[PDB]
Amino acid sequence: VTQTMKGLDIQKVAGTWYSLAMAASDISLLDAQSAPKRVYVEELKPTPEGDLEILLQKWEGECAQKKIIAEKTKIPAVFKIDNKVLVLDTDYKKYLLFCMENQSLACQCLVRTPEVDDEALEKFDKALKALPMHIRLSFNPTQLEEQCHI
Amino acid sequence: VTQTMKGLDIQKVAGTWYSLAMAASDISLLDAQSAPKRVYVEELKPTPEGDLEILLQKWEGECAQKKIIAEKTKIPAVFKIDNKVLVLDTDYKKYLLFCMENQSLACQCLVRTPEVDDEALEKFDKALKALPMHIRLSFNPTQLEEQCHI
Numbered sequence: 213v214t215q216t217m218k219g220l221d222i223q224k225v226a227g228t229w230y231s232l233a234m235a236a237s238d239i240s241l242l243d244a245q246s247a248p249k250r251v252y253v254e255e256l257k258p259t260p261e262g263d264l265e266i267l268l269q270k271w272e273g274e275c276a277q278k279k280i281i282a283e284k285t286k287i288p289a290v291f292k293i294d295n296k297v298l299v300l301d302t303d304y305k306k307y308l309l310f311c312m313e314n315q316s317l318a319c320q321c322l323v324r325t326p327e328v329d330d331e332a333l334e335k336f337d338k339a340l341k342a343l344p345m346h347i348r349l350s351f352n353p354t355q356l357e358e359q360c361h362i
Numbered sequence: 363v364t365q366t367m368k369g370l371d372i373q374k375v376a377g378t379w380y381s382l383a384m385a386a387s388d389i390s391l392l393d394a395q396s397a398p399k400r401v402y403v404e405e406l407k408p409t410p411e412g413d414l415e416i417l418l419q420k421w422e423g424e425c426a427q428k429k430i431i432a433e434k435t436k437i438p439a440v441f442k443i444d445n446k447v448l449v450l451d452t453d454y455k456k457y458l459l460f461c462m463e464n465q466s467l468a469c470q471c472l473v474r475t476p477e478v479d480d481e482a483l484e485k486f487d488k489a490l491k492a493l494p495m496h497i498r499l500s501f502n503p504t505q506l507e508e509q510c511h512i
């Protein structure tokens with residue numbers, strides 16, 4: 213994965229996000245509701261010290277609320293977990309594209325509102341032309357308003 | 363779905379095909395190995411009377427061989443089953459794009475050889491820009507040579 217947000221302002225990505233689309237390099241990373249990289253983002257909480265708290269949801273027969281922290285690195289756009297989180301692109305107000313790397317790649321197109329942003333899905337597809345994705349999912353506005361996008 | 367192969371020669375699509383990519387309007391149509399529209403095409407056998415026998419595989423804990431017939435209609439590119447099969451495009455020698463319609467849409471990019479044809483995946487993505495797909499899958503060359511793409 214050869215794409216990062218130059219000049220990322222991590223502060224400016226705080227608050228509410230929607231997992232509108234997901235892609236991964238193996239079907240099994242996303243295929244089931246229980247699939248390991250099937251995580252829904254609720255909110256991004258950047259610490260004062262420039263780390264990133266992630267509020268998400270994960271189905272494990274329960275939609276479970278889950279709080280994790282991604283530690284800063286020397287590169288503004290890359291963070292470590294427990295496995296790396298890369299930020300590709302964000303306009304801060306509407307969309308944010310990110311990938312998680314073990315290679316067992318998974319990327320999402322986050323958006324601010326429970327709507328289908330065709331502009332943001334274009335960029336996300338463009339950012340994935342380069343990657344070896346074998347499963348892509350997207351969620352309708354109804355499903356975006358529910359726990360675990362049921 | 364507003365795209366059909368004008369001037370389809372059904373005879374010329376006979377024989378060996380690979381289900382390289384799949385897309386559907388709901389995740390549940392493709393998400394599991396047991397998902398209803400998760401069918402792998404083996405061979406296409408057009409009858410003398412212009413019908414289409416489909417040899418496929420479907421996982422139901424067994425990869426099961428399955429023989430079905432799609433009856434001709436007034437339109438060369440549309441066939442009925444038991445639910446319609448539409449043929450979008452084929453160059454006969456390398457690729458064939460088709461959709462199945464109940465609307466619960468599912469489409470595949472079939473290819474002749476167990477290889478990743480980037481040209482055919484482009485056309486297939488172009489034919490799906492128009493459709494309300496929420497799950498896309500693709501299979502590597504190894505998986506194409508196995509029962510049920512395991």
Ligand SMILES: CCCCCCCCCC(=O)O
Binds near residue numbers: 293297310
């Ligand atoms: C910059 C936004 C990153 C979103 C982070 C999602 C990471 C989930 C990790 C996990 O699978 O437990």
Ligand SMILES: CCCCCCCCCC(=O)O
Binds near residue numbers: 414430449462
């Ligand atoms: C023209 C090629 C069409 C392929 C047909 C695949 C239909 C499978 C129907 C079913 O789900 O049982």
